[PDB]
Design a protein around this ligand. Structure first.
Ligand SMILES: [Cl-]
Lengths: 201, 7
């Protein structure tokens, strides 16, 4: 576990105003999702058939270390629940049911149902994550996970059950990366709670 | 290599 990750997580968690600044962006989304007015940290996906829909956080990170919590109820995932980061150019919708995040060079995602990492996924196969998993093996992840973006080292990592799962992706330095997810489940509600950020030393 | 074994 990196020393800086321990430093970020030992800090008191950021308050509501900071969480709202880093929440889902009602202006940067598929039209098939909306940000809930009574809980602006959560979006709701309309029950549209044969559609995959995403949304980005309001803040695109270009430097520093950042962590946010995703709460995605396990029975609201369906065939394709993907969590990760994207540039501003990543598409936020596809026809059909797809792992939209990680499907091209503009995003990096963890397909929760397959326990596979995708980046430029049309060209590159998925990577088993967590590491313990065999080639045809997946793990049923709990509702909550932490997403850790290190823009200075250029890495994305995850923490599940308080266990750091290691670097999932590298090569992110010099970009401007937003939290993102892609969803397919009718009426799913996914919450994102920014925890903290830490400037490089 | 999608969910339905199609790449
Ligand atoms: Cl797909």
């Amino acid at each position: 576990r990196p020393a800086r990750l321990d430093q970020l997580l030992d800090m008191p968690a950021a308050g509501l105003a900071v969480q709202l600044r880093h929440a889902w962006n009602p202006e940067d989304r598929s039209l098939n999702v909306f940000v809930k007015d009574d809980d602006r940290l959560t979006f709701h996906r309309h029950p549209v058939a044969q559609s995959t829909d995403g949304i980005r956080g309001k803040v695109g990170h270009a430097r520093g270390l950042h962590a946010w919590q995703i709460n995605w109820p396990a029975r609201q995932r369906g065939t394709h629940a993907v969590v990760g980061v994207a540039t501003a150019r990543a598409p936020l919708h596809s026809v059909g049911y797809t792992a939209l995040v990680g499907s091209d060079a503009e995003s990096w995602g963890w397909d929760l149902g397959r326990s596979r990492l995708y980046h430029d996924g049309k060209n590159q196969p998925g990577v088993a994550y967590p590491a313990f998993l065999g080639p045809d093996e997946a793990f049923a992840l709990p509702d909550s996970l932490l997403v850790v973006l290190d823009m200075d080292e250029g890495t994305l990592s995850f923490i599940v059950d308080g266990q750091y799962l290691g670097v999932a992706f590298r090569g992110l330095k010099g970009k401007k990366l937003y939290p993102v997810v892609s969803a397919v489940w009718g009426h799913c509600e996914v919450t994102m709670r920014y925890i903290n950020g830490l400037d490089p030393e | 290599w999608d969910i339905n074994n199609n790449x």
